[PDB]
Each structure stands twice: as C-alpha cells, then as structure tokens.
Amino acid sequence: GRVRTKTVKRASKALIERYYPKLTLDFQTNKRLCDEIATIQSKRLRNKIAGYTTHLMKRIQKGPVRGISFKLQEEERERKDQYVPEVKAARSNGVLNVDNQTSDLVKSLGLKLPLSVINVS
C-alpha cells in the first residue's frame, strides 16, 4: 500500500495553512484549484496531494486534529477559552474550610478570615 509520502503530505500540510478558505471535501473541486495556487511537477503527483489534503477538512469539521493551526481554529481557542462565573466566594457551608491546625503564623501574620475547621487518626 494504500502509504503516503512527504514530498506529498508536508506540500498538503503547507497548503492547508493558508487556504482553509475560494476551501473543500466534490475532492474534485480542489484538484482544479490546487493548480491555480501550487506550482506542481506532475498529472499523477497532483491527484495524490489533494486525495491527501481531503483526508483534512474530512476530519477537521469531525474535530481538532494534529500540529496544524490556521487562523480559523486558533481565535476557536480568546472564544472557547473562558470559564466559570462568580469566581470563588463559603452562604453555604458561610465560613471557608482551615485543617483546624490551620492558628499560629497567621495569628503571627492579618485582617479578617470568614475560616472553617477539626477538634481532636
């Protein structure tokens, strides 16, 4: 086999960076396009670049595939980034839990603890 090659991958993997947008999976619409872009030798070589690409946009959609991002996947990570609201505020169990041996340094260090704690295994 059927086992892909560099020249090919590393020609689709360079391409896939810029042209994700023209970008497709009917691969017979890339084939044409993949000439206007690359400056390829051959007809055979060219039909094995786009074959690979279509093996990217058929799995991209399905999810986050690897070591390749194209200004479109990277802005859905500043949009997916963020989250939990409210931040940490205990009322419900108010007093925040503070080992009960957690009183000595901070009696020897501050101002206000609204604390939770283990009277003695």
Binding site: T39, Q41, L45
Partner: protein, 111 residues
C-alpha cells in the same frame, strides 16, 4: 593529480552550475590500484531526470606506468535552461495568498 581535480569543480561551479562530482580510476604512485572521488552541490542518480539534467564523460588517458579513467558529471540549474522541465519531479512550490480587507456594510455605482 589531486590539486587539478579542484579547474575541476571550481571553474565549473563559478559558471552558475548546480553541482559536479569526479571519478579518477587507474593507478596511483601505487602498484596495487585505485579510485578517487570528489564534489560540490546536490546530485541525482535516478529517473528521466539524469536523462534530462546532469550529463557525463570518458576521457581515456597513456601514462607510461599504466592507463587511466576520468569521469565528470555536471548538474544543470532547472531555471538556467527552455530543454523540457523547469524544476525536479519533486519540487512543489507555493503563492503566499492575498491581503484582503473585511466587509463594511452593503454599498454600488452609477454609470
């Protein structure tokens, strides 16, 4: 023979050449033979591409001693050429698309 066997290489390389390796078989000041190899640039040994790119030669030397062979292999700049091909079969070259600006709203003219 060592010295010329850099005007060969360097005289060739100066002349916008892609690559040149140079076999020197025969006998030397030895009695048991050798060969000697040299070189510059990258060089192919397989297909068409030899047929088309590089080229040979063998120029029989009728020393005293005993007889030699010389073998040169130039390589040609795919660009400097016109002969058919302008690259290898390998070389896949890419544009750095265009720098576009987004939307506005609608907008139209009257001609």
């Amino acid at each position: 023979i060592r010295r010329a066997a850099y005007g060969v290489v360097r005289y060739v390389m100066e002349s916008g050449a892609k690559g040149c390796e140079v076999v020197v078989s025969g006998k030397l000041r030895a009695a048991r033979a050798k060969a000697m190899k040299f070189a510059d640039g990258f060089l192919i040994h397989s297909g068409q591409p030899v047929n088309d790119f590089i080229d040979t030669a063998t120029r029989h030397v009728l020393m005293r001693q005993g007889v030699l062979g010389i073998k040169v292999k130039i390589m040609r700049d795919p660009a400097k050429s016109r002969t058919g091909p302008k690259a290898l079969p390998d070389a896949v070259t890419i544009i750095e698309p265009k720098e576009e600006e987004p939307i506005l709203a609608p907008s139209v003219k009257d001609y």
